[PDB]
Amino acid sequence: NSADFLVINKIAKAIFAVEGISRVQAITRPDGKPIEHTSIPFLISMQEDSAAMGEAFDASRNDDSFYLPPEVFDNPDFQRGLEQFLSP
Amino acid sequence: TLPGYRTNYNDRNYLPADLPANEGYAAAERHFSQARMNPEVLMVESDHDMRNSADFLVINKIAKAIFAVEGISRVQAITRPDGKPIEHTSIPFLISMQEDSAAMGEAFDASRNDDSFYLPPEVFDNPDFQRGLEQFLSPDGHAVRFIISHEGDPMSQAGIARIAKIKTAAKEAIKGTPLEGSAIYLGGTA
Amino acid sequence: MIGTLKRAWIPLLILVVVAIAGFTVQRIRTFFGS
Amino acid sequence: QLETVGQIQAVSMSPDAAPSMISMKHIGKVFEEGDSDSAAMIVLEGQRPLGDAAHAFYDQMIGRLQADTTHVQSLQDFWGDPLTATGAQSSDGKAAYVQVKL
């Protein structure tokens, strides 16, 4: 659910913050890189400004905020990766 | 008595306090601190022009990560031109009944919240920004530098142990970012 | 043969000490900078 | 005399292989402000908050300092610039400084 995936991203970031650690890989971070279109300029959604903000937050993998709306669990292109990281 | 021997590198502790250099040291300690006149400079040199809104997020990340070291005060960067974060950059300004949102934004500026930061890309063509952009970024934009101050004595045993911590913080701030693998240089007195 | 080695034991000991010290010194000369 | 030659042929305090010396040289090279590791701080302190007379004197002083190309290699203004001026000033406003590379 969207509520517990926030804690999962929190755990992923907290592990990534250990000193000798590189490339933590989680469901909220499927290639060691955060999922795009999840930073704070995409929970917010003259639009050439907000698009520039969002695409500047995706070119650096900002990772200061994260939602993943609850329509990702019924997306078929998400289940094959959801089975790798979460128990059946 | 030998396993209690502590040394010191502050040369102004072993000189008469009536030297002009020490007089100005005292004049500065009356107003800022004793570590304001001995700053460290950290430079992160990448392989691309970092004068864009995408890389300034990583620059602010490095600045915050260095500021988070224990004995560090007054980190000064382009995203933080006076050791204080730039106003109108916190999260209530990326969001933009308006008397509520203005109060939120001006409450986020009275504390220097520093939980979010954008700097829209129309700051690079602003003439009132280039004179400060030349101080902190290389003339070709490939390097950015941060001016770091200590809290107590820079030349103590703690201020010398802080150098490795500053370098580690700078290296961990760019981990997992497009600036990863950049060269980190730290100069100064400590 | 012992009869002639225990006649030049001082130069041999000096050579051993100089060798050990020189190797340890050229080893320590590489710790700085790195 | 011995002391004359000693002060003539003085050697740097830090080695060339020192990481901090390499760092300072590279920082000066990349930012194009001198290949030295020496730097001074001109502090100007007043009994009352520094105003416009102090700013005019400071502008004239840094103009003078930049002219001496043989000794003064560079300087970080940080106080004639309104964006960064508060970084080179005390909280009470009675002192300001500028770093000069030598």
Curated annotation (Swiss-Prot), chain C:
Disulfide bonds: none annotated. Disruption phenotype: Deletion mutant does not exhibit a low iron growth phenotype, but has attenuated virulence compared to the wild-type strain. Deletion of both mmpS4 and mmpS5 drastically decreases synthesis and secretion of siderophores, and greatly reduces virulence in mice. Induction: Repressed by MmpR5. Repressed by iron. Regulation is IdeR-independent. The chain crosses the membrane at residues 7-26. It is found in: Cell inner membrane. Interacts with MmpL5. Belongs to the MmpS family. Part of an export system, which is required for biosynthesis and secretion of siderophores. Essential for virulence. This is Siderophore export accessory protein MmpS5. The chain holds residues 1 to 34 of 142 of the full protein.
Swiss-Prot record, chain D:
Induction: Repressed by MmpR5. Repressed by iron. Regulation is IdeR-independent. It comes from the Bacteria. It is found in: Cell inner membrane. Part of an export system, which is required for biosynthesis and secretion of siderophores. Interacts with MmpS5. Can also interact with MmpS4. Belongs to the resistance-nodulation-cell division (RND) (TC 2.A.6) family. MmpL subfamily. This is Siderophore exporter MmpL5. It comes from Mycobacterium tuberculosis (strain ATCC 25618 / H37Rv). The chain holds residues 52 to 153 of 964 of the full protein.
